[PDB]
Amino acid sequence: IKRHKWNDFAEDSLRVIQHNALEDRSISDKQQWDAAIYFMEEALQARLKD
Amino acid sequence: IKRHKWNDFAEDSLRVIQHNALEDRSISDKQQWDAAIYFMEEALQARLKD
Amino acid sequence: FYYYQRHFVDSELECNDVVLFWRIQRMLAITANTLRQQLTNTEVRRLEKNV
């Protein structure tokens, strides 16, 4: 574990990867919209319970 | 049109993007498997007709 | 969703939060798959070398 060293170039590559992924603003799938609603409900319920 | 010039960095960025996309080898969706079968059938039929 | 399908911007039902959360969920799915591939391939060789 002490000698473990993750790739340094992975961080730079992933930064662009998720940047382009999050840049989209169109939901073409009806089920994706429903899934986002369910995901929001679970997150909201956890915060509400706290 | 003559003065048009596409971004030079897009080619390098996209090369990695599709490389990682094609590196996956797991189909977790049943409908994706069916869609690939239909896509293969259409491509095969076009080549068969020729 | 049906209202959003027609780009009803004038409609007051501007579900901006739902779109933003959907972007986060989609980003998480891509990130999980990308990390899984990197773990399965990139770091296995380094683990073997250190061992």
Nearest CA of chain B to the CA of A17: how many Å? 7
d(CA C49, CA A18): 30
> Is the C-alpha dihedral spanning A7, A11, A16, A19 positive or negative?
positive
A46 vs B: CB within 8 A = no
Helix (H, G, I), strand (E, B) or coil at B7: coil
Please give the single-letter amino acid code of residue A2.
Answer: K
Q: Supply the angle between the helices B9-22 and A9-22 in degrees, to the nearest 10.
A: 90
Closest Cβ–Cβ partner in C17, C21, C27 for A18: C27
Q: Are C30 and A18 in contact (CB under 8 A)?
A: yes
Q: Do B17 and A17 touch (CB under 8 A)?
A: yes
How deeply is C34 buried, as exposed, middle or buried, from its count of CB atoms within 10 A (0-12, 13-18, 19+)? Answer: buried
Locate C48 and state its tokens: 């073997």
